[PDB]
């Protein structure tokens, strides 16, 4: 509500870095659910062993 | 994700410049309606002279 320009400037580039980091943590939580499918694979295959 | 987050920001731009160029012709179309009355009037003035 009547933030003016430098401010709205500020507030999207903000969100752009907080959208940013965000898409970093869910691409970390997509690798961590792939190394848990890994785990699962190899734990499986050593036990069958 | 981020070319995606950037297509949606285009969008926006491509909804705002539409804005603006209403806004542009309704502003130019009131310019030429002022520019044909002040033609008017200079003629009415050079034939009272």
């Known amino acids: ?49 | 994700t981020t070319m995606r987050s950037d297509n949606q920001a285009l969008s926006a731009v491509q909804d705002a410049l539409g804005l603006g160029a209403a806004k542009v012709d309704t502003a130019y179309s009131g310019m030429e309606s002022a520019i044909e009355v002040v033609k008017e009037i200079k003629a009415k003035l050079v034939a009272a002279t």
Do not use: C, P, Y
Request: net charge negative.
């Open chain 1, 1 to 49: 509500v009547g933030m003016g320009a430098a401010a709205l400037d500020a507030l999207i580039s903000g969100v752009d870095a907080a959208l940013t980091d965000m898409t970093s943590a869910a691409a970390s939580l997509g690798s961590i659910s792939s190394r848990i499918d890994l785990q699962s694979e190899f734990v499986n295959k050593l036990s069958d062993s």
